[PDB]
Scaffold this active site. Structure first.
Site, PDB file in Angstrom:
ATOM      1  CG  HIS A 119      85.237  21.709  -4.303  1.00 19.06           C
ATOM      2  ND1 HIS A 119      83.982  22.211  -4.016  1.00 19.06           N
ATOM      3  CD2 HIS A 119      86.105  22.730  -4.095  1.00 19.06           C
ATOM      4  CE1 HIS A 119      84.098  23.467  -3.615  1.00 19.06           C
ATOM      5  NE2 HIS A 119      85.376  23.807  -3.658  1.00 19.06           N
ATOM      6  N   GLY A 192      73.559  27.331 -10.264  1.00 15.62           N
ATOM      7  CA  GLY A 192      73.298  26.245  -9.326  1.00 15.62           C
ATOM      8  C   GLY A 192      74.334  26.053  -8.227  1.00 15.62           C
TER       9      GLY A 192
HETATM   10  N1  APR Z   1      67.686  22.763 -11.177  1.00 20.36           N
HETATM   11  C1  APR Z   1      68.180  23.825 -10.480  1.00 20.36           C
HETATM   12  N2  APR Z   1      68.175  25.056 -10.990  1.00 20.36           N
HETATM   13  C2  APR Z   1      68.652  26.149 -10.348  1.00 20.36           C
HETATM   14  N3  APR Z   1      69.173  26.081  -9.107  1.00 20.36           N
HETATM   15  C3  APR Z   1      69.225  24.891  -8.459  1.00 20.36           C
HETATM   16  C4  APR Z   1      68.696  23.677  -9.110  1.00 20.36           C
HETATM   17  N4  APR Z   1      68.866  22.670  -8.251  1.00 20.36           N
HETATM   18  C5  APR Z   1      69.440  23.191  -7.139  1.00 20.36           C
HETATM   19  N5  APR Z   1      69.622  24.506  -7.257  1.00 20.36           N
HETATM   20  C6  APR Z   1      70.251  25.425  -6.287  1.00 20.36           C
HETATM   21  O1  APR Z   1      71.625  25.122  -6.408  1.00 20.36           O
HETATM   22  C7  APR Z   1      72.304  25.499  -5.208  1.00 20.36           C
HETATM   23  C8  APR Z   1      73.349  24.450  -4.892  1.00 20.36           C
HETATM   24  O2  APR Z   1      74.131  24.968  -3.791  1.00 20.36           O
HETATM   25  P1  APR Z   1      74.783  23.929  -2.772  1.00 20.36           P
HETATM   26  O3  APR Z   1      73.847  22.756  -2.482  1.00 20.36           O
HETATM   27  O4  APR Z   1      75.407  24.648  -1.599  1.00 20.36           O
HETATM   28  O5  APR Z   1      75.980  23.303  -3.670  1.00 20.36           O
HETATM   29  P2  APR Z   1      77.386  24.026  -4.049  1.00 20.36           P
HETATM   30  O6  APR Z   1      77.239  25.530  -3.978  1.00 20.36           O
HETATM   31  O7  APR Z   1      77.893  23.326  -5.259  1.00 20.36           O
HETATM   32  O8  APR Z   1      78.303  23.503  -2.847  1.00 20.36           O
HETATM   33  C9  APR Z   1      79.643  23.911  -2.815  1.00 20.36           C
HETATM   34  C10 APR Z   1      80.494  22.837  -2.172  1.00 20.36           C
HETATM   35  O9  APR Z   1      80.026  22.631  -0.853  1.00 20.36           O
HETATM   36  C11 APR Z   1      80.591  21.427  -0.374  1.00 20.36           C
HETATM   37  O10 APR Z   1      79.672  20.802   0.533  1.00 20.36           O
HETATM   38  C12 APR Z   1      80.939  20.605  -1.614  1.00 20.36           C
HETATM   39  O11 APR Z   1      82.373  20.547  -1.597  1.00 20.36           O
HETATM   40  C13 APR Z   1      80.431  21.441  -2.782  1.00 20.36           C
HETATM   41  O12 APR Z   1      81.210  21.307  -3.990  1.00 20.36           O
HETATM   42  C14 APR Z   1      71.242  25.585  -4.119  1.00 20.36           C
HETATM   43  O13 APR Z   1      71.220  26.919  -3.602  1.00 20.36           O
HETATM   44  C15 APR Z   1      69.934  25.203  -4.816  1.00 20.36           C
HETATM   45  O14 APR Z   1      68.851  26.071  -4.498  1.00 20.36           O
END
Ligand code: APR
Ligand code: ZN
Length: 274
Positions: A119, A192
């Protein structure tokens, strides 16, 4: 975008320990281990995620802005970032696929040749002409693959950010390396990420499809939960601290931002249990 604000889950201590031992076992027994990281691995450093309880999109739904406890520049790699540096150094990590734009993997000293940043990266700009990338010490200043206002020095071509916008397609090389690593992996571990963005979120399944094992480490449910061989509900830093302990590995200290372009041959690592 996607499913926001789902309740989190925490495996109790004995459940967690058992699951982390099982993960250690999978790591020991797998020749190719590929990690897939999302925004959850950066929350312990002060960067909010997108779909967690106070995630960017979750908060947007409430007409609230996201809260940072750091700038991207003053952000420190977490224990999880550093554990992945060490796993790579000792040869227990083949490749790393990230959806994060926070620049923390690069700045932790993770070798860029074993990293796909699907990304983009806030600190990286790319020549429109020659395609040579520049890792900067501070965020580039633009998003959406726009002109940064700098010229290339390898050429004088126009430098642009690498932050993908909604409609923008993924970087060709990073996705090619991510695919190759995931299809050929014995074990994919997600950390995560809720796995809701294609193609990023489906890459760990290509490992499952090809006969490999799948581990999902996440506080909330994910899209592909049912396909995982082990699901671990806990803070990643805790999961990784416990894993490294079992593997007999120190988590190295971060000495400030450092860019490494290419991986070295594996360092010595402890012998495997019976
Ligand atoms: N300390 C932690 N430990 C374990 N899990 C965690 C922690 N903090 C957050 N989480 C989990 O991490 C997950 C992050 O998922 P998203 O917020 O959807 O992020 P991500 O999957 O990286 O998003 C993908 C993509 O979406 C777009 O909006 C953006 O381009 C991003 O790169 C969530 O389900 C949350 O519960
Ligand atoms: Zn150029």
């Amino acid at each position: 975008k996607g499913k926001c604000g789902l309740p989190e889950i925490f495996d109790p201590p004995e459940e967690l320990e058992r699951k982390v031992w099982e993960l250690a076992r999978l790591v020991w027994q797998s020749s190719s281990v590929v990690f897939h990281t999302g925004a959850g691995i950066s929350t312990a450093s002060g960067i909010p995620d997108f779909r967690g309880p106070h995630g960017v999109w979750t908060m947007e739904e409430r007409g609230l802005a996201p809260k940072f406890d750091t700038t991207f520049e003053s952000a420190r790699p977490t224990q999880t970032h550093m554990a992945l540096v060490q796993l790579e150094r000792v040869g227990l990590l083949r490749f790393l696929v990230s959806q994060n734009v926070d620049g923390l993997h690069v700045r932790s000293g993770f070798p860029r040749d074993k990293l796909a940043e699907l990304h983009g990266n806030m600190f990286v700009e790319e020549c429109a002409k020659c395609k040579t990338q520049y890792v900067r010490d501070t965020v580039v200043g633009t998003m959406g693959l726009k002109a940064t206002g700098r010229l290339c020095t390898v050429c004088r071509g126009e430098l642009r950010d690498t932050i993908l916008d909604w409609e923008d397609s993924l970087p060709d090389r990073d996705l090619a390396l991510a695919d190759e690593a995931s299809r050929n992996a014995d074990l994919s571990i997600t950390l995560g990420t809720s796995l809701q963005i294609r193609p990023s979120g489906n890459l760990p399944l290509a490992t499952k499809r090809r006969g490999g094992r799948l581990v999902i480490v996440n506080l909330q449910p994910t899209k592909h939960d049912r396909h995982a061989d082990l699901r671990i509900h806990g803070y990643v830093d805790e999961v990784m601290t416990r894993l490294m302990k079992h593997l007999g590995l120190e988590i190295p200290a971060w000495d400030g931002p450092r860019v490494l372009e290419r991986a070295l041959p594996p360092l010595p690592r402890p012998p495997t249990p019976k």
